[PDB]
Design a protein around this ligand. Sequence first.
Ligand SMILES: Nc1nc2c(ncn2[C@@H]2O[C@H](COP(=O)(O)OP(=O)(O)OP(=O)(O)O)[C@@H](O)[C@H]2O)c(=O)[nH]1
Ligand SMILES: Nc1nc2c(ncn2[C@@H]2O[C@H](COP(=O)(O)OP(=O)(O)O)[C@@H](O)[C@H]2O)c(=O)[nH]1
Ligand SMILES: [Mg+2]
Lengths: 220, 186, 439, 437, 31
Amino acid sequence: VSEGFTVKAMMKNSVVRGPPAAGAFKERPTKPTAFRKFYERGDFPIALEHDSKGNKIAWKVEIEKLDYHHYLPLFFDGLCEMTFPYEFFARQGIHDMLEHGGNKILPVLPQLIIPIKNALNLRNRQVICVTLKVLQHLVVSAEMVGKALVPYYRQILPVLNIFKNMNVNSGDGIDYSQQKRENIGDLIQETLEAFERYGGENAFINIKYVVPTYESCLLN
Amino acid sequence: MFKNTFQSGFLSILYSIGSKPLQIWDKKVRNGHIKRITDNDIQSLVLEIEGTNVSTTYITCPADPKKTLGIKLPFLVMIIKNLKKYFTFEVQVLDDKNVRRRFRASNYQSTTRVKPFICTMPMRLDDGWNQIQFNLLDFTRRAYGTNYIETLRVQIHANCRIRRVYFSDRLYSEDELPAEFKLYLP
Amino acid sequence: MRECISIHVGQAGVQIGNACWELYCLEHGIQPDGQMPSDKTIGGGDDSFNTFFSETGAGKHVPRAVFVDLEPTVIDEVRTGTYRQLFHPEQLITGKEDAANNYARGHYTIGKEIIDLVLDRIRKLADQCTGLQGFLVFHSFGGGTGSGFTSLLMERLSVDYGKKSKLEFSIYPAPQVSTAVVEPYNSILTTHTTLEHSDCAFMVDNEAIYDICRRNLDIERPTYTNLNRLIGQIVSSITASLRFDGALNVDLTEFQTNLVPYPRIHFPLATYAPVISAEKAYHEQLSVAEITNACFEPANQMVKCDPRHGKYMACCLLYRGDVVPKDVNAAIATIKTKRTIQFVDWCPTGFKVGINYQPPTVVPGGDLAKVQRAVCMLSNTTAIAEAWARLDHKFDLMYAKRAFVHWYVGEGMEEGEFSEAREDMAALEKDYEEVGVDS
Amino acid sequence: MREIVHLQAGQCGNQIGAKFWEVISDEHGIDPTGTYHGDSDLQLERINVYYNEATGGKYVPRAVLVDLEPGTMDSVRSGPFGQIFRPDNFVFGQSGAGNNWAKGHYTEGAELVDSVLDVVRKEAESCDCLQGFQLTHSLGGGTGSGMGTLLISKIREEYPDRIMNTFSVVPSPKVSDTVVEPYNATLSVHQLVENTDETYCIDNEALYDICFRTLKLTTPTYGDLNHLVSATMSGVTTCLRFPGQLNADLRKLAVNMVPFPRLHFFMPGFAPLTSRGSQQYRALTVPELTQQMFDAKNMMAACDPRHGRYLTVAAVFRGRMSMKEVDEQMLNVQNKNSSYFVEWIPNNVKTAVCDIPPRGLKMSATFIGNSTAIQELFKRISEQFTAMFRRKAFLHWYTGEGMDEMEFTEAESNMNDLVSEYQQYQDATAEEEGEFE
Amino acid sequence: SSMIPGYTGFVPRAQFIFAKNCSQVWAEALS
Ligand SMILES: Nc1nc2c(ncn2[C@@H]2O[C@H](COP(=O)(O)OP(=O)(O)OP(=O)(O)O)[C@@H](O)[C@H]2O)c(=O)[nH]1
Ligand SMILES: Nc1nc2c(ncn2[C@@H]2O[C@H](COP(=O)(O)OP(=O)(O)O)[C@@H](O)[C@H]2O)c(=O)[nH]1
Ligand SMILES: [Mg+2]
């Protein structure tokens, strides 16, 4: 064996060792988050209601009058948790606040980019599917939310570029796990068309700038 | 293949509902994938072909390169979904003069070109689910002015969702179609 | 009376063009300053020079060439070198800020500023012609000017001029060595807009001429000067029946008819024989049968594709020098008896023969030695079906990740014109296997 | 026909460009007075690429010297070749930046850029057909980087369809002579990734390593350091001023090397470098140039190319040589070292050959590699930035001048996205399968 | 006069000479 770009590599029968893998696809270790330390201290007005139909978070206080400046950055910071009591409070609390938000979701959007990016940078497949389900739901919350993510395409999309190519190749096998929606590359195409439709006039050129293999869906 | 069989009314060479839909089609995939998933609009199984490159990912009939179909029926009808990405398909015919021709239908080409070996024409795909009806008999008498005898190969390229590629002897309306052949939207 | 207009385009067009006109002056005894000498006569003075030259009444000869480039670095070598006085000043056409090896820049942005100026000089060269045989175009597939502007140079020469012959002398990119990275992208898009506008298209690639210059000419370190001297000998032998009387003369429209089976198939392989140096030229007795075997030998082809992998369609042999029609017909009959050279079953009379009288002319400082006879072969095989099967891989190997597409798209090209030119090449690969298959 | 306006910012930029102008004045045959004293006609054939004609047979450079301290340009003008510059082309502030990117960008830099851009407009509109602009600077100080980034971001807005080269002396780990250096570097790469057509990364640590264990210099002063950078600068654009067999200018090199618009950070090298004692004993040909330009100790950045994969390589040879050897040696290099080149780009090497050799040499070669090993040069600066910024050291010297704490985190996030996209273009297969398992 | 008209190279003190053609201004610049 030998290293490249030497006189030992330029032999008639020598063997050259390749470069080490960079690690663009390997899972990264997690770090302690701020959602865990604010739930254990007791600031969140949430409680898990065990229902017969399923699991639903019960809110002691109304959801409309909550201070979304303090909680929306904090609840997105729970997207990096994988243990049971914190992963359910994270994503289910996110969707209900986005549902009953109204007019106040737009000014919090500058403060939401950093926990969005850190959720996708773990390179863990289960977190990526849940985070991408929120990103499709986030853009349809109000009217002018969609046009504000256009400056922030350069920070979210470089991780969406990596996993757009993954999909199943069972040439005639039926997919029996369509309900769970774990195909990341099926979700990324589904997510990116929602960014372009609600983005506005200048949405297409910004996505293709970051994701190179893109094709416009609104334009014919 | 279908020289011995009866040929009248319809002939079906693909269907997305079955044990082995792609038994006779040769699957060539490169930078792409093929699967079978439930549709969101018709609530039924459709085939899947996707890929960043249009040319490499296709399925061809028959699987053997030497074998030919030999279908005498004029019109080729396909039921596919518009996804607003690049898509092509070929049909190869046999004229009266016993010379094999081609007909390529690209949705991105704007120019129509005619040539003795291949004549490429544009196509416009309406949104949602739509049904393509092709005329092999008139397009041979228009491009080359020869008669029509038989059809040998059909290829379906990337970025489409395929269900029930079928031939016909003429163009029936939606009323004259049976229950199995018409697309049933809820 | 039979007249042609050479159109050298790009740096590969000019650098090849300097080799041709240095050769064309020496065949007709014309000095570099333009005038034939008065103390000496080199050859009998005839109207043979009229195919490439126009004679001013004072006694000057001006070439029928239009040198086309988008940067001034290579044209000013013509304006300063030995042949500065031979060319009319307005023939040498020069732009600004080249093409940057970008097909879209040489087609949609830069070339549209110079298209009207070149076509005005083409008119004033073809207006003097009492009868035009057809233009000759010299270009290379690799770069931007030779690929982009040449793509729409023939689009305007086809509308303005109806069925005048427009021959190509292309430089195909080599399979392994190549001086560019976007090189597959230029040659896919070039052929898409050239399969319809070109009447013939000969190809030589730089890798095969490198091998011939080392094993046959015994040159250890070939340069681009030694390669362009070989290409000039091929283009001289094609037009040597136009200028000098012969036993069997072949016009440009004659072998254009007699090589192409179908309109898409105009890609001959050009081989030349013999290519031997001065130490081995005078020991070998080069008979007609000796020099016609070196053309069919698969190592002596000038395109990196093996003729034994395919089947021949038709051939055009062009013998020059001290040859007789007996020795030609005896040597062809030997080739037909062999079971390794294979011809298609629907072409029994596979060969076309041309004989000229004037032998090839040696240039001072060159590498080849002067010989009494030589042959140039323009074969048409199904072995060219493998040259693009590699280049269709190289185009598809990058285009699945959309590398370098952001440069071509931003100059005016749509995204679909990359893919619609890829489908035009995959139709050509299936086109040859159905032609070559037996009945 | 194609003019380039030189611009230089800061003390590092002024020293580097002064050495560069001396080097190419020696190349084009111009005395310290300014006149032409040469013995060839090819030197003066294309001299308007860089010079501007004056009255009386004199040539002045097309250079603009921006600085925030007049002592540096006094040292520049009091040098050997310092009298050839027009005195109008010096533009100085009155108070120094203080190695403060905030002072050189917001507080003190905004009062000088109008006067600078007046000279840039005056000197760029008097051309025939402009090729582009050139800048030399370092990402450690405040004047070179803080003014330089804003200068690029205004020149790009004024002239978008032009080419823009920059030569960045980015900070080095073990040589670092500035405490506040990673702050300036992290806030400067954020602008260089978006406002620049080509960036050449040069490391002082690698310059010391090359100048010592290859050149064999007992005392490598900054003159001997800047000689290397000037030689590389000359070799990049010699194809634009001298005729060649196969030529390629800046636009052609950018088009063939840059695959994606965010990836334009290049590694240089030079090829015939050797000691004075061993210069007479060494025979130099195309294999020696290829071996020395592809050798990993010869890189002018502190990044080992064996740690990643070459995206795109270019080589610009100078001299009289045969093209078969030039193509054959770099086919052999690619064939032998098959795993260090990306598999989704075939024949990764671009070649150019220029005829006229440099002074005192019969053959030379310049290497420009777009490699993936810049990910470690970015991650090292990122961790040195995060270690200082987590405890918020030296932050008041920036946030008292009109900045927020959010911009530091935004710059760190942008540079980490840059790292991630080099990682995806490193570990990418030709077939999109075999990666997600 | 070793160059032809249309030459794009630089000739010294050729901008000052006016109202003559290329060969005349090149001769007066060289002389
Ligand atoms: N056969 C042959 N090919 C040459 C010669 N010189 C250059 N080439 C080829 O030309 C190709 C690139 O074209 P260029 O030399 O750059 O000239 P161009 O076609 O006008 O392209 P631009 O410089 O961008 O305008 C290379 O791939 C070479 O193979 C030559 O002397 N002989
Ligand atoms: N390569 C090189 N580096 C230099 C030179 N002069 C200074 N430096 C480096 O530049 C850094 C300081 O940057 P500085 O000159 O203060 O930038 P400024 O604020 O614009 O003047 C130091 O760490 C030096 O290592 C030089 O001539 N050559
Ligand atoms: Mg060129």
